[PDB]
Amino acid sequence: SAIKPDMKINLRMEGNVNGHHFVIDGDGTGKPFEGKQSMDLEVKEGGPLPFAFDILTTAFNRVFAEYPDHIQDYFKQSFPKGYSWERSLTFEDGGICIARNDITMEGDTFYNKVRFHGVNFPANGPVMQKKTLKWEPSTEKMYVRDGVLTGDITMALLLEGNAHYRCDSRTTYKAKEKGVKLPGYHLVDHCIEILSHDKDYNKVKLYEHAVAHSGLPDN
Amino acid sequence: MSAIKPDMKINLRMEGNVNGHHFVIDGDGTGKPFEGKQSMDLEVKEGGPLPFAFDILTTAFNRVFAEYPDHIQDYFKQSFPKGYSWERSLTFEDGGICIARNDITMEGDTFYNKVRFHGVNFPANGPVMQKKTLKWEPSTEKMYVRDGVLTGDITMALLLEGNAHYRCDSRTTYKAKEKGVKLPGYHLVDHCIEILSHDKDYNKVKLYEHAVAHSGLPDN
Amino acid sequence: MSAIKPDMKINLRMEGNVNGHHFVIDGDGTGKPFEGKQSMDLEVKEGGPLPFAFDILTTAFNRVFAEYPDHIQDYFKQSFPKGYSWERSLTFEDGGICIARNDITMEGDTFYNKVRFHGVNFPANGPVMQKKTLKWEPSTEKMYVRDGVLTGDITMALLLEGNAHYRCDSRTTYKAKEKGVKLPGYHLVDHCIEILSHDKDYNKVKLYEHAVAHSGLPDN
Amino acid sequence: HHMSAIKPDMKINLRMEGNVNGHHFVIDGDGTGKPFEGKQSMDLEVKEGGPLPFAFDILTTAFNRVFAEYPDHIQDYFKQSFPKGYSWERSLTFEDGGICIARNDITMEGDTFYNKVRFHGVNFPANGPVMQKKTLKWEPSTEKMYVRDGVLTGDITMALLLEGNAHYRCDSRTTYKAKEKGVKLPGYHLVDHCIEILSHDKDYNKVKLYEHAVAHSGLPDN
Ligand SMILES: O=S([O-])[O-]
Ligand SMILES: O=S([O-])[O-]
Ligand SMILES: O=S([O-])[O-]
């Protein structure tokens, strides 16, 4: 009842990768029921960012995800009060990130409080060298663990030069209100895209498409 | 003289050791390469009854059985008639680790599979030695090139009795026998594996699996 | 030239968040860098009482307090006057993951510590959220250079109630503030960290640590 | 609690079968050791699959924790498992995806320990240190011993020194199990080791291997 077909979103991410502090302001629109959202982002300090913007992109709301009827939608059922997610990103070269987002809503807008942190990215690695092109599309596996909805994902960044950079992520989602029903095992296909940006990535426009499904042969 | 025919046969021998238990499993079955479907009947010839869950073996009993669409290169069907081999490592969240290998070849309408499977470090209280597993959930394997070889990464979950999952992380490497097989670009493979039937000790099992490659969203 | 005195003060502020719970922890201590020893009294200024095992934070409260033999380069004694930073990941066997960083500087007789600590994904019924930890066991860190930076790898174990162990994989990267301080070759550190005393809610903690460097067998 | 019959100068017989990246091999070895001094060594000869297309170094830890100096205050699980013996299973995970599985069955007849080892390795990259044979030595390290899921378990983060002097990381988990009943389980401890190829021929077809291990309690107890 609370979510509408078209909603706004405000976002304030703050973080540190490799000792580098940054703030990023975001403002955007999207269709929760179509699994879509875009948003305009602007680094407000920390720019020029010394690292690849790509590592940030998954960390700027699953509520924007096309859920089919045979699958419980934890995220759209979390609102008004909202929900929180925490995430770790484990890169194949030792680079490790942790993140959190408190997602809230009032009126037509979703509010996202997001903290990002990253450690141990190697000097001549693709992240500090900015050799990343984009996230390749993948599929997140959703399941319950310790009484909590958990998502594991097998993720890859395309690099300059016809090779890929592995990332492995675990997310833990918690609805704020008591009583929200945990879903069964499902899978969530997603694509993420930087549609436009300036040369140093101080201002970027980002797009996310997400759809949930029960996998083969039901997808 | 096309190598891949619409209805083909599968001949399999697996020999292995998990936690120091030796075993031999012979397989016979069939499948439809272009539809990405296969089924086979397995018979434990040595080492029955198996002390561990049969489920840990079932990915190791052929990606030639995957429905590839036009716009994605099919390494597997292009690997024939000479064939290919794969190597896989399976890392479970409780420390059990398996490695396996299959050299697969082809004569006429039949694929031959010479498979080896080794496991160690499964705890006695774990869902594997307790034979507490139910099925592999559906999952998506990521295909991409690493050091000039086709590589596949997958995070799979084994559903357990009692409404719980058991995580396995798997990496496989596929190498065509013949020189000059064109490697595919990055893509996804969806799959499902289902034990369709089994006798009480799992000495005789009917297995079925379906694989479909694709390019992820938006495209389907 | 190092300007490390044989008795030094230690001043520290830690700020952070584990599983959404934000805490601030102030420390005051002293140490003897040349025999590898330091102890500090902590008190949590924000976030008391902490909902999680205090022992996970304990690693994060300076390898100058390590005993280095003459035959091994002491990167940490040599990073001063200017100081140094370290970054560190802590991956626990049940999916809990922490990152931490410290910027260490020296003003006279006192080392100053800016520490941030963030922890994610601890399961509600794991040893951390239920406070079933007893101590870190004594272990050994592997120091070596990777990509131009002193790196320390170690697998640690936190003793649990009943004498079970909880396993933590840690990686730290240490960076001298000033350019062209020299790189040690492969060596080992031994460490022990012991919580000496604490009140009921671990809001006042008194922590001791001992660390010595060596080159391993047969030298030792 | 029980006379080991381990006599302070003992022999070692060993047969190994393996496969790494699809290459089959058999290595034999005869050796000697001093179990109470935690020192041992062996002459190995590659009997099949020679010359090996991979770094010999990956195999060297698979060729017995009986040869480890245990001080009185730490339970020695290995010498107490004799005369009957014991077995281990081990997984080796390298930072670039190389994964290995190894197991050994140790028995004792009279003066001689007998080892049946299996070793299998998978997914070593073509231009990695292993396949390109660019390893030099294992650095000294320290394994942590503790009971896990009821079984004596050894964890260790090792590193192979490589040509060009970078290191190549490997993470090992070993499980040890006595053949007979009644063997006491140690408390947590540490075991230092150092392994060294003493001498070898061009193709690593004949190799001389030595190791030294001593168990201890960490700090500041050592
Ligand atoms: O290039 S695709 O991700 O639109
Ligand atoms: O894999 S299907 O048959 O569940
Ligand atoms: O003599 S020892 O260093 O192998």
For tokens 């996230």, the residue is A135
Nearest chain C residue to A119 by CA distance is C87
Tokens matching residue C33? 């860098």
CA of C175 to the centre of ligand 2 (A): 52
Residue D196 in contact with ligand 3 by CB distance below 6 A = yes
B125 to D22: CB separation less than 8 angstroms, yes or no: no
CA of A2 to the centre of ligand 1 (A): 32
**Cα distance between residue A135 and residue C142, in whole Å:** 33
Taking residue C37's Cβ as centre, other Cβ atoms within 10 Å add up to: 18
Taking residue D76's Cβ as centre, other Cβ atoms within 10 Å add up to: 20
Q: Is C138 on the interface with D (CB under 8 A)?
A: yes
Instruction: Find the helix or strand (DSSP H, E) in which A129 lies.
Output: helix A126-129
**Cα distance between residue B35 and residue B69, in whole Å:** 10
Instruction: Find the helix or strand (DSSP H, E) in which B182 lies.
Output: none
C-alpha distance across the termini of chain C, in Å? 29
- Interface mutation vs chain D, best among B147, B174, B183, most D CBs within 10 Å: B147
- All domains of chain B in start order, with CATH: 1-220 (2.40.155.10)
Residue B195 in contact with ligand 2 by CB distance below 6 A = no
- Interface mutation vs chain C, best among D74, D192, D211, most C CBs within 10 Å: D192
Nearest chain C residue to A144 by CA distance is C123
Instruction: Find the helix or strand (DSSP H, E) in which D92 lies.
Output: strand D86-94
Nearest CA to A146 out of B127, C167, C124, C129 is that of: C124
**Alpha helices, DSSP H only, in chain D?**
77-80
Instruction: Find the helix or strand (DSSP H, E) in which D54 lies.
Output: none
Q: Which ligand is nearest to the CA of B191?
A: 2
Q: For residue C11, count CB atoms less than 10 angstroms from its CB and return exposed for 0-12, middle for 13-18, buried for 19 or more.
A: middle
Q: Are A153 and A169 in contact (CB under 8 A)?
A: yes
**Cα distance between residue D166 and residue D40, in whole Å:** 28
Q: Is A162 on the interface with B (CB under 8 A)?
A: yes
Residue B192 in contact with ligand 2 by CB distance below 6 A = yes
Q: Which ligand is nearest to the CA of A209?
A: 1
Q: Which ligand is nearest to the CA of B212?
A: 2
Q: Is C154 on the interface with D (CB under 8 A)?
A: yes
Instruction: Find the helix or strand (DSSP H, E) in which C175 lies.
Output: strand C165-176
The number of C-alpha atoms within 13 Å of C16 and in the hemisphere containing its C-beta is 28
Atom of ligand 3 nearest to the CA of D194: 4
Q: Are strands B8-18 and B110-120 parallel, antiparallel or unpaired?
A: parallel
Residue C219 in contact with ligand 3 by CB distance below 6 A = no
List Cα–Cα distances, D53 to B73, D49, D161, in angstroms.
31, 9, 19
- Residues paired with residue B190 on neighbouring β-strands, in sequence order: B140, B212
**Cα distance between residue D113 and residue D111, in whole Å:** 7
Nearest CA to A141 out of B132, B190, B213, B99 is that of: B190
Q: For residue D95, count CB atoms less than 10 angstroms from its CB and return exposed for 0-12, middle for 13-18, buried for 19 or more.
A: middle
Q: Are D160 and D139 in contact (CB under 8 A)?
A: yes
Residue D192 in contact with ligand 3 by CB distance below 6 A = no
What's at D44, amino acid-wise? L
Angstroms from D58 CA to nearest CA on chain C:
19
Q: Are B168 and B126 in contact (CB under 8 A)?
A: no
Q: For residue C77, count CB atoms less than 10 angstroms from its CB and return exposed for 0-12, middle for 13-18, buried for 19 or more.
A: middle
Q: For residue A192, count CB atoms less than 10 angstroms from its CB and return exposed for 0-12, middle for 13-18, buried for 19 or more.
A: buried
Nearest CA to B171 out of B146, B138, B207, B194 is that of: B146
Query: What sign for the dihedral angle of Cα C43, C48, C52, C53?
Result: positive
Residues 6+ apart with CB under 8 A from B172: B86, B87, B88, B89, B141, B151, B152, B154, D123
* Region class of C38: left (phi > 0), else alpha (psi between -120 and 50), else beta: beta
For tokens 């190697």, the residue is A122
Residue B212 in contact with ligand 2 by CB distance below 6 A = no
Touching partners of A (3+ C-beta pairs < 8 Å): B, C
Q: Are D196 and D169 in contact (CB under 8 A)?
A: no
Residue C218 in contact with ligand 3 by CB distance below 6 A = yes
Of C121, C125, C126, the CB nearest to A86: C121
Q: Are A119 and C91 in contact (CB under 8 A)?
A: no
**Cα distance between residue B140 and residue B156, in whole Å:** 8
Residues 6+ apart with CB under 8 A from A178: none
Nearest CA to A118 out of C153, C116, C145, C150 is that of: C116
B137 to A141: CB separation less than 8 angstroms, yes or no: yes
**Cα distance between residue C106 and residue A5, in whole Å:** 57
- Technique employed here was X-ray
Q: Is C149 on the interface with A (CB under 8 A)?
A: yes
Q: Are C127 and C158 in contact (CB under 8 A)?
A: yes
Q: Is C37 helix (H, G, I), strand (E, B) or coil?
A: strand
Q: Is D198 helix (H, G, I), strand (E, B) or coil?
A: strand
**Cα distance between residue C203 and residue D124, in whole Å:** 49
Tokens matching residue A21? 């502090």
- Residues paired with residue A21 on neighbouring β-strands, in sequence order: A16
Touching partners of D (3+ C-beta pairs < 8 Å): B, C
Atom 4, ligand 2: which residue's CA is nearest?
B194
B215 to A168: CB separation less than 8 angstroms, yes or no: no
Q: Is A166 on the interface with B (CB under 8 A)?
A: yes
B190 to A143: CB separation less than 8 angstroms, yes or no: no
CA of D194 to the centre of ligand 3 (A): 7
DSSP assignment letter at A126: H
Long-range (24+ apart) CB contacts under 8 A made by D179-184 are: D179/D81, D179/D84, D179/D85, D179/D86, D179/D87, D179/D107, D180/D81, D180/D84, D182/D1, D183/D77, D183/D80, D183/D81, D184/D1, D184/D75, D184/D77, D184/D80
For tokens 């399961």, the residue is C123
Q: Is A128 helix (H, G, I), strand (E, B) or coil?
A: helix
**Cα distance between residue A203 and residue A197, in whole Å:** 5
Output the DSSP codes for C99-167: EEEEEEEEETTEEEEEEEEEEE---TTSTTTTT-EEEEPPEEEEEEEETTEEEEEEEEEEEETTS-EEE
Q: Are A138 and A190 in contact (CB under 8 A)?
A: yes
Q: Is B24 on the interface with A (CB under 8 A)?
A: no
Q: Is C144 on the interface with D (CB under 8 A)?
A: yes
DSSP assignment letter at A33: G
Tokens matching residue C78? 């040599």
What's at C103, amino acid-wise? D
**Cα distance between residue B56 and residue D211, in whole Å:** 36
Nearest CA to D19 out of D59, D69, D57 is that of: D59
C165 to D159: CB separation less than 8 angstroms, yes or no: no
- Residues paired with residue C92 on neighbouring β-strands, in sequence order: C168
Residues 6+ apart with CB under 8 A from D203: D46, D50, D51, D52
Atom of ligand 3 nearest to the CA of D198: 4
Tokens matching residue B52? 């561990």
Residues 6+ apart with CB under 8 A from A125: A93, A95, C147
Atom 2, ligand 2: which residue's CA is nearest?
B194
Q: Which ligand is nearest to the CA of D196?
A: 3
- Residues paired with residue C118 on neighbouring β-strands, in sequence order: C17, C99
Beta strands in chain B (DSSP E): 8-18, 21-32, 37-46, 84-92, 97-107, 110-120, 133-136, 139-146, 149-160, 164-176, 187-198, 204-214
**Cα distance between residue B188 and residue B190, in whole Å:** 7
**Cα distance between residue B89 and residue B101, in whole Å:** 9
Resolution for this experimental structure (Å):
1.9
Instruction: Find the helix or strand (DSSP H, E) in which D5 lies.
Output: none
Phi, psi of C71 (to 5 degrees): -80, -5
